[PDB]
Structures are given as C-alpha cells and as structure tokens.
Amino acid sequence: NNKRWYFTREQLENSPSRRFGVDPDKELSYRQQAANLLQDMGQRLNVSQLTINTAIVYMHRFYMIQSFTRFPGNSVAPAALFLAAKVEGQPKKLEHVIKVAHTCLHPQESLPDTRSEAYLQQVQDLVILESIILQTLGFELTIDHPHTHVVKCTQLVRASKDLAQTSYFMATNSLHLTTFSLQYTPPVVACVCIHLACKWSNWEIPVSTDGKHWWEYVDATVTLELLDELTHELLQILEKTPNRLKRIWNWR
C-alpha cells in the first residue's frame, strides 16, 4: 500500500547493506554511483529523462531489500534501465543495452564477439537480474515522479521560465543525490525543489490573499519547518557535487 515503499530515518539506517558492514556514508555513494551509471547509459541509449528517473527509483527501492554487497550497482543499473524503458514504452533491445553498459563500464575493454559463450552468459545474466528486480518490487512498477507536480506548482506560482527550469534541475538531482524519494511523496518533494529553486534565485512568492503560503495548495501536510530542513540537506550535498551547482549559477 501507500506505506510499503516509504521508510523512516531509523529504517534507512538499518538498510540491508548496513547489515553486511557497509557504512551509511559508503552506501549513499553506491547509490549516487548507480544513478550516474543510469544517467550516462540512459543518455547514450537516447531514452527520456523520465525513464532514467523510473530506473533510478527502482534502484533505490531494490536496495532497501537487497544488499550492495550481494548485488553490485554496475549489475543492477543496466538491468533496471532495461526494465524502466520497457515500462515507459521506450523499449530498448537487450543486445543494445548490453552493448552500452559495456562501453560505459569498460571504455577500454574490447567488446566480445556476440557469438561467445562469455557473451551469451552475460545476456542471460541481465535477464536473470531483471527478474530478481521484479520479484523484489513485487511487480509494482508504476512510478510517480516529483516532476509531474513541479509544472503543476511552478505554473500556479507564476514563476519565470528560468525559475521553473531550476526547479526541475533540483528535482532530477534530488533523485541522484538523495533518498528523498524513499521518504517523501513526490508531491512533498516537489515543494522542496521549488522552495530551494526560489532561495537560490532570490525569488520570493508572496502570501495568498488569505495568508496561506503557496505550498499549502499543493499539500497540507507540508510545513516551513520541514521544507527548510529538507532544502538545507539537499543544498548541502549539491555543494558537495563538483560542477553540479555551476550549472545553475547566475554567472552574470
């Protein structure tokens, strides 16, 4: 139901991986890494950012049941991407996903003769994994991403073309850089992204005719306390990611 795939902070500490000795700091790294792998591959396979994101969620969720020590990100990522693409009606050929995953993880390696046993095996390997992903997710593959809710909000906040782009930027990055999607509903996360997008650009959106802040019209569970704490967390890790913030920095 609504609570299956959402976790408390305490539950996030007790991840299947922490159970096999993986530091919580390390683990987040494994996550970000996969996300990158997903992003890089997704772009070379020329799928939509939507699918890339759907794959990324599958990944985050997978690793709340499975441990990194038993399923390496470089194995799951291609599998999950292959899947998300099928689900988002942008299906990519199995051979073609294998090929791109190879050159991504082995820019140097020589691609095997598709006739090889060692190649035939790695095809079967991907497929096995995609299956292990389905059964992990209990066949729940309909995702919902903050992005939908971004437009809905930004529009109704009447915010410049630019402000709006920064907001989706925040969205796509919260997926690579944080586990917000495992703790907060797409709608709530969207408010977080827009809040920060405003703080970053010195936009302030004035109080409705009622005294009610914009976000309340997007979700009444949300509060300034929360938004402030969350954007701080998100902004911090952005500051950590080389060149990420450069992308939206008002250079003028």
């Binding site: 049941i65 899947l83 099928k86 497929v127 995609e130 389905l134 059964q135 992990t136 209990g138 309909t142």
Partner: protein, 310 residues
Amino acid sequence: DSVECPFCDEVSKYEKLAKIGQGTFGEVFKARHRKTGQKVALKKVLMENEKEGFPITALREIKILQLLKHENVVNLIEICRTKKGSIYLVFDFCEHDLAGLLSNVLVKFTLSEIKRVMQMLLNGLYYIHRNKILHRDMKAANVLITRDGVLKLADFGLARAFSLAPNRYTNRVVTLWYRPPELLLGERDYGPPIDLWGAGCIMAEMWTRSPIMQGNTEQHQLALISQLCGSITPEVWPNVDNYELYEKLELVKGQKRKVKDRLKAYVRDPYALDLIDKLLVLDPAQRIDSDDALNHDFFWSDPMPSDLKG
C-alpha cells in the same frame, strides 16, 4: 545461495485443481489456497518466445490490472513466482463464464436477468474507459459471472491505455466476429467505441445463444456486417471514404439495415432491440457510449433488472 523476496510469494501456496483454459489458451488453472480454501485462477506468463526478458505485453497487462479496481472487473490478487523459473498472475476465481452458459441448452435467462447482465457489463465498460483503458478483446468468453451473480470483465492481455492527440494504435485487435468496422477498414486512430461494438454482439448473443456474425476472413466478416447493418456509405458513415482499404476491398452496396428485422424473432422487447441497434451502429462516432446505454429506456422499463440465481 538464493535471495530475498518479501513481496512475491511462491505459487506453491496454491494447490492446483483443474485447467479451465481450454485450447491450451493461457494455461489457466483453477486453484485452492492451501491454508484457507480460497479459490483463485492462475495464469502462467508464457514467454516461450520472449528473447527480450520479461514480456513487455505482460508488463502492460499487469500495469492495467493494477490500475482497474471495480465491482465488474476481474481482480488481480497478486503475482507469484515459482522458485528455470516462471511467473503467475493470480485472480479471484469466477464460477461461470458467459460463453459456457450461452452454449449450455439447460441454462435459461428471463428478460429481467438479461437486463441485469447487460447493465453490469456496460457499467464495467463505462469504468475502464473512464480510466483511459481499451479492452480490445470483447467476447462472450471474456465475460465471467461469480457464483453470486456479479459479472466481471476479464482477460486484459490485449488491453491497452489510450488518450488524445493523431493516435497510431495496432490494428489487428479483437476477435474477428466481435471486431468493429473501423478496424477492418484499417483504422488506427480508434477508441472506446470499438468496445461497444463488442457489447452489441454479446447483447444479441444473449438471445441467439450464438455468435451472430462468424466471418472466416476480414473480407467475409465485412460481408456479413453489410448484410446486417446495411452497406458502408459516406452517406451512412460520413468520411468512411478516406480509408485506403475502402475501395481496395469493395463490398456490395445494395444493402439495407436488417438489425431490427433479422433479430425481431429472438428478441421480443422493443427496448432491447432498440438498444442493440444503437450499439451495432456503423460509424464509431455515432455509436452509443456506455453512459447513454446505461440510461437507455431498456434499463428503466418493466421488467426491471433482477438478481441472478438460475
């Protein structure tokens, strides 16, 4: 050295009973939950030919059963694994299927009971369309009835989501006998109206006890349809003359609608006849929709729709 799996139970929790799915269509079994006796239907996901991982068509159907939750739509309880492996869709079991009853000579319907069936069916249609889903496989056989007389629309294998723009959908969908003119003429920008055409064929089947137009090929099918509904004229069907398959398949044009006349025998009720006639309309644009059908005087005249026992 196997792995965790909290959200996907092994199908072995069910004890198999007896293959319902004849013509090995599906490999569908009846089963009994080992602990509680609860009866279910199991469909295995085939994929003998899938060389592209888990069948994308399975993924679609699953997406759709997950979405649709409604009194007149069959219920997917969960999906099960085997533990080489295989995957099973698990459904609430339904006692009868409409085709089995219509074929059985002992079974008998009153006008009152038939009204009820059509009402539940049309309600189901209203619902899935409200939900942007096209069933695309309307037939007697795909319509189940529970031991307590509730109708369920079943088999979403061929079903698919739809929307608004120009649409480019797969054409060769729906059983031949239950397929509507649009598709046979090569339409790929079709919608909910194709399901209602199906509803029509089924409604009639409620009295004739037998699929009404059984063509051997599309040519033949379209022949039969013209011999029942009249012939396809840009006059009768505005802009029908825009399909390539129109004159490159030309069928005879000395033909006038016998929908009411030819069925007059089997159906007594003037209302039931009028409703059928509004479903079996040539131009999809002019074909009645589920909402108006439910409002048709057929459902609001005597005898009023009744419960199901025999």
